[PDB]
């Protein structure tokens, strides 16, 4: 995903090899389900939501708002963002211990 984006997007049971978000867009991407160890990397002022997944591969957090919710297992996590009104990292009911 690139460029200017607005509104809300939904993916359900959408198995994916990896996901990437960039640009100056400010939309809301919502994920759900899936049975593959997907990767993530968000560098944008958008808002990112992930929930109800058995696994998730490497995760990168350079910018934006990332909310990890109800994940069975996470391979690894990283974060180097900077303070702004669009950036905040929150995690809910997810373990890093395989």
């Amino acid at each position: 995903g690139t460029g200017n984006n607005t509104g809300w997007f939904l993916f359900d049971e959408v198995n994916a090899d990896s996901v990437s978000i960039t640009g100056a867009g400010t939309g809301e991407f919502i994920f759900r389900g899936g049975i593959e160890q997907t990767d993530f990397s968000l560098n944008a002022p958008s808002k990112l939501l992930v929930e109800n997944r058995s696994r998730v591969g490497v995760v990168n957090h350079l910018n934006g708002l990332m909310i990890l919710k109800d994940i069975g297992v996470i391979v690894s996590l990283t974060s180097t963002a900077e303070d702004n009104a669009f950036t905040f990292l929150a995690v809910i009911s997810s373990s890093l211990f395989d």
């Binding site: 100056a24 400010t26 944008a44 002022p45 910018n63 900077e82 702004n84 009104a85 669009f86 950036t87």
Partner: peptide
């Protein structure tokens, strides 16, 4: 007011 914020408009 208008401006560029944290890489966004």
């Amino acid at each position: 007011i208008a401006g560029c914020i944290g890489g966004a408009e």
